[PDB]
Nucleic acid binder design. Structure first.
Length: 150
RNA sequence: AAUUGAAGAGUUUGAUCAUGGCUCAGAUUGAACGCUGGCGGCAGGCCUAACACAUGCAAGUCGAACGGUAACAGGAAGAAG
């Protein structure tokens, strides 16, 4: 019931004294399938150590999302660095139809059938960060009615 | 009951993030070309030279408008084997 999946692995470099030194970065997202989404970055010298650090950071640093029946509630826009992201609840608008690196976080998030369209930059490290910010500041009808009295 | 509706990716760098262009994945067509080709249904078929046109048809009808008889088939009368 952990439901982990990796989005992006890259080879970064460092350029020391004698030549270059190549390191690998993972970027994974875990989530239970009912709210509870996390992402982790993690970087290491080989690929399986990178993904393992990424999973291990992603299992902690996990955020609650106030889902609807199987989906979002109201249309929400989350931004991070250069990466602007729209989402629309699509009240059984079948299938998760999101961009790459947004399909994954929305998939393990437990949502099933939203409509997305990322704008701006679509770097995978910043398009999540713009989905969680997004799903984090999406509030439910029992939270809005809690705030404003009824 | 009559709008249930939205996906990205590759490429600037030793690597990064951003900006930014180029390019790809889709659908479409009065299409052409290449390879191949069994049947049917429904549609479509000179986008260019509003260039030049052989030949055949594409606008005739009415005698219940009229003088009339060129034919065709009868009618009447005459003459002949």
């Amino acid at each position: 019931e952990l439901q982990e999946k990796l989005i992006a692995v890259n080879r970064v470099s460092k350029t020391v004294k004698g030549g270059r030194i190549f390191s690998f970065t993972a970027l994974t997202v875990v989530g239970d399938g009912n709210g509870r989404v996390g992402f982790g970055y993690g970087k290491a010298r080989e690929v399986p150590a990178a993904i393992q650090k990424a999973m291990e950071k992603a299992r902690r640093n996990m955020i609650n999302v106030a889902l609807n029946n199987g989906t979002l509630q109201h249309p929400v826009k989350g931004v991070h660095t250069g990466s602007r992201v729209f989402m629309q609840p699509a009240s059984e608008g079948t299938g998760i139809i999101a961009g790459g690196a947004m399909r994954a976080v929305l998939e393990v998030a437990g949502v099933h059938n939203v409509l997305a369209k990322a704008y701006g930059s679509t770097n995978p490290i910043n398009v999540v960060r713009a989905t969680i910010d997004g799903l984090e500041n999406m509030n439910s009808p029992e939270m809005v009615a809690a705030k404003r009295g009824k």
